[PDB]
Amino acid sequence: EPREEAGALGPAWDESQLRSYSFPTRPIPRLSQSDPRAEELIENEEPVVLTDTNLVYPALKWDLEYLQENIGNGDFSVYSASTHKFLYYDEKKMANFQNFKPRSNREEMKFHEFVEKLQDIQQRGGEERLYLQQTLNDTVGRKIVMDFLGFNWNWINKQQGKRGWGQLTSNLLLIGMEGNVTPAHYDEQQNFFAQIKGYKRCILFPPDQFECLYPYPVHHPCDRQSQVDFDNPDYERFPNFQNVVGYETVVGPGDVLYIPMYWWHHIESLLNGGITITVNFWYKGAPTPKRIEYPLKAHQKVAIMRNIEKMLGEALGNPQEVGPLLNTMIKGRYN
Amino acid sequence: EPREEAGALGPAWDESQLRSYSFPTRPIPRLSQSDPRAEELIENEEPVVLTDTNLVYPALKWDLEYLQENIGNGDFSVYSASTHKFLYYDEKKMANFQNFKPRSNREEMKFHEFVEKLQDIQQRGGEERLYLQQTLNDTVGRKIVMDFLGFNWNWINKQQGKRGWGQLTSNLLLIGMEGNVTPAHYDEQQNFFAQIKGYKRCILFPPDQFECLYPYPVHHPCDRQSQVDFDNPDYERFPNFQNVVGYETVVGPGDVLYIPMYWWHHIESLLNGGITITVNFWYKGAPTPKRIEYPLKAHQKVAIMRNIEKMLGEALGNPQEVGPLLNTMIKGRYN
């Protein structure tokens, strides 16, 4: 259920701010970072919400005014859409699918321009939606540098070390409008997802649900995203979406969600909850083990399938020949 | 049409000795080895019957009496069946499919034992069928050595050299009963198929008909054989068998059929034509080219599909997991 805020502020959010979907879910555990069970979940690459890491404690004071005053004069990537769904797409792959027309568009702008566009949308009551999604880099102003340095590196560096992960590759700053949705997808890195402002409902699905979630082809710009429209699922094309079962939580300021590598996740900013702010922490996964144990884990089979698709696209010299060859291999032979 | 034998012997065979099938065919060209068109067909890896190679001229005098007197005291592999279909199967793969029960069985015996079993079947009017299929080796007696040495090595060595083929790997001696059928399959070597006694109807299908002919999985004992029962084709499982088109010929004594690598072939000993004798000449194909041209040839796509199946069987640690992974890759994604 919704957590009750300290100082008798009442529930932070209520069930009416969540979107309605076709599948059941069960809760992700919420634990203290000092809890042995939390350590066990991370070690076993299962999701857990940690409530008291202080991972981004200096950033809890961030709002638009503070950020605009201090985040510098760099360019920020801002996506715009006329739908609540901000489906990720890879611009380098759009040459493979000249028919793909994205529903959101990216515009580079300064942070004050982003705040002003937000304001102009609000005052005008327009329906346009904005989602800022920008890697934190060395153009940020001095106060953001000091905040960043004050993150809990002691705790997260120990996690990286304990799990055998590779390097931190980036920190993504995410600033969304109430009701924004990032559709279900999986990432090939480990993720500590640090909520700063507002509330996000996070629905995760394990790597073993691949067959229920129908990712796009690897060569498609929406590689790693589910083809299924969660708001209107097409059960004739995606019949096993009727078997999907999620793991759900709502994170608020101060919470950190461990999103394990390969785990599907659907993320939404609560309806009528105001803007949301998140900083994630992406780490490369640990090296492949010396001794492979059989049978393989689900995420290892996912990796195999990605590599088969990549190899065939390269070998056939044309991504579009991958599907026809796979169908020929299987029809009347394996199905 | 049937060739007319020299000395006014009439047609060697008639259309009534051919089995009836569901697909159309067109004829394989019959040419002289001196014909530039024959050289062009071989170079382009298309089938051709050569009528005057003298490839196995010393063996044209072979019959059972001669062979039994001279072929030595080695063991010969003899397959037995209660059906006319001698479907090839790989005994080393039978551990992958404990449910596979072959319809023919192999027995090792001396050549005179094979002749005597033939005779006992004849006199008794039984329905058992025998097919001898034995690699020629150094146990053969002296007269067979002299015959073998008198094959036209000058001509076939020049072919090997001109085509860039690798080594001769073996010569298979095939002795069948009238009406025996080897079901459709392809071989991964180049083949000069030298007819010695009796007549065989040879139906070939190009490598581009893979999708009409439904080979077994690579790990199955009948790897490289069509799953389709040509006598009773199951069009619900194998719908593209309704699109198959063959290239047909009947070879008799003195003829050589070039069966190019990867080409499907169905081979039958004519009904009521007596026993048949063939010696084939298997050569490894030429190395893979330095510069791959795109798009790939059909046989190159066949090679890719075999290697994908082999890799997945090895990577998943279990052949039986190959089909499920391929289906998961494709369903709702590529089909």
Partner: peptide, 17 residues
């Protein structure tokens, strides 16, 4: 070492970078 080759992980994520 075909298995090691095939289970090699990528590192793609939903990042603009």
């Amino acid at each position: 070492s075909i298995v090691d080759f095939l289970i090699t992980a990528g590192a793609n994520v939903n990042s603009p970078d």
